[PDB]
Amino acid sequence: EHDWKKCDQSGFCRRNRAYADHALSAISWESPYKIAPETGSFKDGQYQAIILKTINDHGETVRLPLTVSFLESGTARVTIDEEKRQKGEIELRHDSKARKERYNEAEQWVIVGGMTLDKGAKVDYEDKTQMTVKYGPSSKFEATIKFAPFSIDFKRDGASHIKFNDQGLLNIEHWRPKIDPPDDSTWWEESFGGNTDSKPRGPESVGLDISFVGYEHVFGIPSHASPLSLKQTRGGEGNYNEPYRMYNADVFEYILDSPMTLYGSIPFMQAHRKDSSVGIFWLNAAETWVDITKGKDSKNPLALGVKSKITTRTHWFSESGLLDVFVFLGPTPKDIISKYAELTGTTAMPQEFSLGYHQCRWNYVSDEDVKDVDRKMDKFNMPYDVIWLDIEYTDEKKYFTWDKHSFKDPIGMGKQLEAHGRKLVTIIDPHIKNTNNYPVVDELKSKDLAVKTKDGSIFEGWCWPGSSHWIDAFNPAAREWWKGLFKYDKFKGTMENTFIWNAMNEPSVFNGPEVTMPKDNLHHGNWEHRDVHNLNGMTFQNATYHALLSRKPGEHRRPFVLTRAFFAGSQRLGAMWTGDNTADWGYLKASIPMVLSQGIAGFPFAGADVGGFFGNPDKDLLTRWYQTGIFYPFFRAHAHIDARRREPYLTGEPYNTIIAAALRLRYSLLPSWYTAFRHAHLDGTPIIKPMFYTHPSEEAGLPIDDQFFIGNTGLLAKPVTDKDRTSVDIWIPDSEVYYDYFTYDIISAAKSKTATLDAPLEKIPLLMRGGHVFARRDIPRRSSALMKWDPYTLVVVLGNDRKAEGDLYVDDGDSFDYEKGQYIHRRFIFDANTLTSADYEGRDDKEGEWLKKMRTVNVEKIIVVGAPAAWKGKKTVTVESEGKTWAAAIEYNPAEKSRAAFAVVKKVGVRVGADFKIVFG
Numbered sequence: 001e002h003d004w005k006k007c008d009q010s011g012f013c014r015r016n017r018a019y020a021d022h023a024l025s026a027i028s029w030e031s032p033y034k035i036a037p038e039t040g041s042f043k044d045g046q047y048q049a050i051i052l053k054t055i056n057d058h059g060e061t062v063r064l065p066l067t068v069s070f071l072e073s074g075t076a077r078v079t080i081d082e083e084k085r086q087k088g089e090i091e092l093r094h095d096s097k098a099r100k101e102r103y104n105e106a107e108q109w110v111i112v113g114g115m116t117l118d119k120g121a122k123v124d125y126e127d128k129t130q131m132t133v134k135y136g137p138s139s140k141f142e143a144t145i146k147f148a149p150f151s152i153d154f155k156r157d158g159a160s161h162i163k164f165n166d167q168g169l170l171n172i173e174h175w176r177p178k179i180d181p182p183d184d185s186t187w188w189e190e191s192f193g194g195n196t197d198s199k200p201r202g203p204e205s206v207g208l209d210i211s212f213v214g215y216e217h218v219f220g221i222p223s224h225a226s227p228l229s230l231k232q233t234r235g236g237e238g239n240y241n242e243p244y245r246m247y248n249a250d251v252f253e254y255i256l257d258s259p260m261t262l263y264g265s266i267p268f269m270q271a272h273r274k275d276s277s278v279g280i281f282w283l284n285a286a287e288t289w290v291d292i293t294k295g296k297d298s299k300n301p302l303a304l305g306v307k308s309k310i311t312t313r314t315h316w317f318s319e320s321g322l323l324d325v326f327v328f329l330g331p332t333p334k335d336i337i338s339k340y341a342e343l344t345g346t347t348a349m350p351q352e353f354s355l356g357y358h359q360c361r362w363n364y365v366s367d368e369d370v371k372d373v374d375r376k377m378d379k380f381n382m383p384y385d386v387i388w389l390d391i392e393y394t395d396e397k398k399y400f401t402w403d404k405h406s407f408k409d410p411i412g413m414g415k416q417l418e419a420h421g422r423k424l425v426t427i428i429d430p431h432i433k434n435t436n437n438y439p440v441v442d443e444l445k446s447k448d449l450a451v452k453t454k455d456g457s458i459f460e461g462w463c464w465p466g467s468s469h470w471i472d473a474f475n476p477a478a479r480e481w482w483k484g485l486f487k488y489d490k491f492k493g494t495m496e497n498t499f500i501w502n503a504m505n506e507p508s509v510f511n512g513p514e515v516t517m518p519k520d521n522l523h524h525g526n527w528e529h530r531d532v533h534n535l536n537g538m539t540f541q542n543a544t545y546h547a548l549l550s551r552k553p554g555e556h557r558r559p560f561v562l563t564r565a566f567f568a569g570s571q572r573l574g575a576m577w578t579g580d581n582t583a584d585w586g587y588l589k590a591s592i593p594m595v596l597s598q599g600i601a602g603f604p605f606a607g608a609d610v611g612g613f614f615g616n617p618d619k620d621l622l623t624r625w626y627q628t629g630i631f632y633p634f635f636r637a638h639a640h641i642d643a644r645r646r647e648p649y650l651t652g653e654p655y656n657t658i659i660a661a662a663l664r665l666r667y668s669l670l671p672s673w674y675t676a677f678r679h680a681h682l683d684g685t686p687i688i689k690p691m692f693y694t695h696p697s698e699e700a701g702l703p704i705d706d707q708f709f710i711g712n713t714g715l716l717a718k719p720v721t722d723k724d725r726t727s728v729d730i731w732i733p734d735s736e737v738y739y740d741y742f743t744y745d746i747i748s749a750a751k752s753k754t755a756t757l758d759a760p761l762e763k764i765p766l767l768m769r770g771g772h773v774f775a776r777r778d779i780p781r782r783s784s785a786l787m788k789w790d791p792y793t794l795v796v797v798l799g800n801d802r803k804a805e806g807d808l809y810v811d812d813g814d815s816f817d818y819e820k821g822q823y824i825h826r827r828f829i830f831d832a833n834t835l836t837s838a839d840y841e842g843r844d845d846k847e848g849e850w851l852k853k854m855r856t857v858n859v860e861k862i863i864v865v866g867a868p869a870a871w872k873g874k875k876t877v878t879v880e881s882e883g884k885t886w887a888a889a890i891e892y893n894p895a896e897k898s899r900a901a902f903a904v905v906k907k908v909g910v911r912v913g914a915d916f917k918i919v920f921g
C-alpha cells in the first residue's frame with residue numbers, strides 16, 4: 001500500500017504554496033526582489049546584474065546574480081543563482097560533504113545546442129527603473145526588465161505574451177543557519193515513508209510565477225494521467241486541488257485523471273491560442289511542482305467591472321538548484337517545439353525494427369517458450385519484429401547473467417529469431433544484487449561506481465534481487481565501465497540482434513521513501529539526490545545507449561533502448577512507455593492524450609502497454625487496444641505476472657482476424673512511420689500530431705486530444721476507446737476533403753464540423769486528408785526486415801486543388817551511414833496532372849552498398865483518390881524516369897454514392913531512388 005506526498009507533506013511545496021496564498025491575499029504585495037541598476041551591464045547578447053532580496057523588516061539583503069541571455073534562435077534564457085553559495089560561504093549540517101553551490105550541471109546533461117548568443121540584440125530603451133531589449137528575427141521580440149520590483153515582460157507583435165513575477169511569486173530560498181529564535185517546522189529534518197531526510201542544506205527551493213497572457217490553454221509537462229490540455233490545480237469543478245508534480249517515481253496502479261507524478265518528467269510547457277503560441281522550459285532536475293489557474297487579469301479573477309480576457313497563471317517551484325528558464329515566442333507550435341529540440345536534441349534515428357510490433361510479458365519462462373511463441377505468431381499470420389524477456393530470464397535477479405535451468409541455449413534462441421530478421425530484447429535494471437561470487441557487484445563496489453548515502457557510505461536498499469546497490473550513472477567512469485559489460489564476448493548469450501530495456505530507473509527502491517532513494521543520498525560530484533533526481537533515469541538510459549553503439553570491434557550502429565524514467569533530452573537515447581497501466585477502458589482512452597503529450601514535449605517515441613499491464617482485458621478491449629496501439633510510435637504488448645497469457649493468437653475468432661488486420665495496417669504503413677521518425681530526427685517534429693499543432697488557426701482544436709495526424713501523411717486517426725461503441729464522431733479540422741482510408745467514402749468536403757462514422761469492432765477509423773501523398777508497402781511479410789526490398793505503393797490524396805505533396809525516407813535502418821548521405825529521401829508532388837519525385841534536399845548524384853541494392857526497389861503502384869473527371873476513359877499514363885519514357889495502364893473509377901472517384905496505376909516500374917514524372921489525363 002503506497003504512500004505519496006501530497007503538496008502539504010512536501011515541505012518546500014507547502015512553503016511555496018503558502019507564499020502564493022500570502023501574496024494573493026495581501027494588499028499591495030510587492031516581491032521583495034530588486035535589480036540594483038548600477039550592477040547592470042548588457043553586452044553581446046547578455047544582460048548581467050545582481051538582484052537584491054530583502055530578507056527581513058530590517059532591510060538586510062542577499063545577492064542573487066541574474067543572467068538574461070538572448071539567443072540567435074530568438075529564444076531567451078533567465079538564470080538566477082545565489083552569490084553566497086557560489087562562493088562557498090555557508091556551512092552544511094551534520095558535517096555533510098554535499099556540494100555547497102546550487103546545482104548547475106542540468107545544462108550539461110540536457111542542452112546540446114542552440115546556445116549561440118545573438119550579438120544583433122540590443123538595448124532599445126533604458127533608464128534606472130527599467131530596460132527593454134530587442135532580439136530575435138529582425139528584432140521582433142522585446143523583453144522589458146523592470147528593476148523594482150523585479151519583473152520581466154516578453155512581447156512581440158505589440159503585446160505581452162509571457163510575464164515573469166507579475167504576481168510577485170519569485171522565491172529563492174536563501175541559505176540560513178539553524179538558529180532558535182532570540183514557521184520553520186519544514187526547514188530541517190523531514191520524515192516521510194519510513195525515512196528521515198537529514199536536509200543538510202536547509203531550505204533552498206526556487207520558484208516563480210509565469211503568466212501566459214490572453215492564453216486559455218496550456219500543454220506539456222508530461223508524464224501525467226491527464227488531458228493534453230492541462231487542468232487548473234487550485235480547486236473548482238473539473239479541476240485538481242494539488243499542483244502537477246514532477247518527481248520520477250514507481251507508481252503501482254497509478255490512477256486516471258490526476259496531477260500525481262509518474263515515472264518521467266519533462267518540464268516544458270506551451271500555451272496556444274488561435275494563431276499564437278509561446279512556451280517555456282524550466283531547466284531543473286529537482287522535484288518540481290506546477291500550479292495552474294485561469295481567469296481574468298484582476299487580482300480577484302471573478303470580479304465585475306473588468307475586461308473578460310483570460311490569462312493562465314502558472315506557478316513553478318523546484319526543491320533546489322538554479323532558477324533557469326528558457327522562453328519561446330513561437331509564434332506557431334511547430335516553431336516552439338523545433339526550438340526546444342535545438343536546445344535539448346531531436347529524436348535519435350531509430351532502429352527500423354523498433355517501429356515494428358513488440359511482443360512482451362512478465363515473463364516468457366524458457367527459451368522453449370520464446371521459440372514456441374515465435375512459431376505460433378507465424379502460424380496465425382501475425383507479424384512482429386521483437387520478442388521481449390523480462391526479469392525472470394536472469395540468474396536470481398543478477399543482471400548480465402541467465403538462468404541456466406530455464407534458458408539453456410540463448411544463442412540458439414537468438415538465431416531462430418534471426419531467421420526472420422527478428423530481435424530479442426532483454427531487461428537490465430540499475431540495481432546490482434549485493435551477493436557473493438558476482439563480479440559485477442565486486443567491480444561496482446571496488447571501483448566506487450555506486451550511489452552513496454548521506455555520509456559517503458555505499459547506499460544499500462531492496463529491489464527485485466533483495467539487498468542491492470545502485471550504479472551511479474552520473475559518474476562518467478560508471479558509464480565507461482557499464483559499456484564494457486555489454487560486449488558480446490563479455491555478456492554471454494547475447495548477439496547482434498539483442499537489445500536492451502531499462503526499467504526501475506527512477507530509481508525504484510522498494511523499502512525507500514515513495515519507492516525511491518532518500519534525498520540526502522550522494523552522487524558523483526557530491527550532489528545530493530534531491531539535486532538530480534529527475535535526471536537519474538536518463539543518466540542510466542544514456543549509459544545503456546552508449547554501450548550498444550559498439551559491442552565488438554568494427555561494430556558501430558544505432559542503439560535501441562526502452563526506458564521507464566526519463567527527462568528532457570531522453571529523446572536522444574531511445575523510446576519510453578507509460579509504465580504500469582491497467583487493463584481497462586479508461587486506461588485505453590487515457591493512453592492517447594499521454595502519448596500525444598510526449599511528442600509535443602519533444603519525446604515522441606512513446607507508447608503504452610497494449611492490453612494494459614495489470615489484469616485481464618476482455619476480448620473486445622484487447623482488440624480495440626491493438627487498433628489504438630498501431631498508432632503509438634512505440635508499439636508493444638505487455639502483461640503483468642498475474643495476468644493470463646494473451647499473446648494475440650490466443651484471443652479467438654472473430655478477434656484474431658481483426659487484430660491481425662490491425663497489425664497488417666501498422667506494417668503496411670511502416671514506410672510512412674519511418675519517414676515520420678525521420679522528421680522527428682531532423683527538427684523535432686512530433687510523430688503523431690494533435691490538432692493544436694496541425695491547425696493552429698482553429699480555436700476549436702485546442703482541447704482535442706483523441707484524434708491526431710500521422711507524420712506527414714495527412715492521415716487522421718480516431719480510434720475507438722469506449723466499451724460497446726459502434727460509431728465515432730470525428731472532428732473535421734478545416735474545409736479540405738477527407739476520405740475514408742478503406743472505402744474512399746467522402747466524409748467531409750468544404751466545411752469544418754463533427755462527422756459521424758460507422759465504427760464496429762472490425763473497423764479502424766482512419767481518414768485521408770486531401771492535399772497529401774504517402775507511401776506504403778502492400779505485400780504482407782512476417783517482419784519489417786523481410787519487407788526491406790519490397791515495392792512501394794504511393795497514395796495520392798486530392799482535394800479540389802488537385803494538388804498534393806508528401807515524402808518518403810529510407811536507409812539501412814541500422815548504421816550511421818545516414819550521416820554521410822547514404823539514404824533516399826523523396827519529395828512527391830502532385831500538380832497539373834503530374835506526379836513527380838525529386839530528392840527532398842535537392843542533392844545532385846556516391847553509392848554505398850545499401851543504396852546499390854535499392855536500385856532493384858520500385859514504386860510499382862499509384863492510387864489517386866479524388867481523381868478528376870477528365871481522366872474518365874483514359875487508359876494509360878505517361879511515365880518518365882532516368883531518360884526513359886513509357887506508358888502504363890491506369891483504371892479510372894467514377895464516384896459512386898458517397899464514394900470518391902479514384903484511379904489506380906499498376907506496374908509503374910520505376911526505381912524508388914531516381915527522379916520521375918508521371919503525366920495523367
Ligand SMILES: OC[C@H]1O[C@H](O[C@@H]2[C@@H](O)[C@@H](O)O[C@H](CO)[C@H]2O)[C@H](O)[C@@H](O)[C@@H]1O
Nearest residue numbers: 250251252362390391503508579580640
Ligand atoms: O520487471 C518486471 C516489471 O517491473 C516493472 O513493474 C513493476 C510492477 O510489475 C509491480 O510488480 O510493482 C512494482 C513496484 O511498483 C513495479 O516496479 C515494470 O514497469 C514492468 O514493465 C515489468 O514487467
